[PDB]
Homo-oligomer: A and B are copies of this chain.
Amino acid sequence: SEIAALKQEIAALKKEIAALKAGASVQTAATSWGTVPSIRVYTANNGKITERCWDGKGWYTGAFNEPGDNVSVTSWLVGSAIHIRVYASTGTTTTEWCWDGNGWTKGAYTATN
């Protein structure tokens, strides 16, 4: 019956991986500012984070393009200038990315002192 147990094991093994990846989806983060408002939506997909932008008219693709399997975001206004920080994580490594009005740059964030 060992071969029959293998047939059952193969079926259980195909079910266990089908179910894993079936329930798998992309992960997003969002932030907004002003009264219009502007909206930025960051999507982690297959180890890549990309950005979509809304400034009142329609949606378009933003500059942000960095690696990661997970993303979070916060932002604040200095008067009307927007400042954005995006936290991108692969494995156990979190990288901070900074928008301060003139391009994305790597930030000072570290996970442990």
What residues of chain A have their CB less than 8 Å away from a CB belonging to chain B?
A: 2-3, 5-6, 9-10, 12-13, 16-17, 20, 23-35, 37, 39, 41, 43, 45, 47, 52, 54, 58-61, 68-70, 72-76, 78, 83, 85, 87, 89-92, 94, 108-113
Closest to A68 in B: B25
This chain: copies in complex: 3
Cα-based distance from A52 to B110 in the complex (angstroms): 8
Known contacts A24-B91, A34-B76; 12 further A-B pairs (Cβ under 8 A): A2-B6, A9-B13, A16-B16, A24-B69, A25-B90, A26-B91, A27-B70, A32-B75, A41-B109, A52-B109, A59-B108, A59-B110
Q: List 10 A-B contacts (CB under 8 A).
A: A2-B3, A24-B91, A25-B91, A25-B92, A26-B89, A26-B91, A26-B92, A28-B89, A45-B92, A61-B112
- A47 CA to B23 CA, complexed, in Å: 8
The answer to whether B89 and A39 have CB atoms under 8 Å apart is no
The residues of B that contact A10 with a CB separation of less than 8 Å are 5, 9
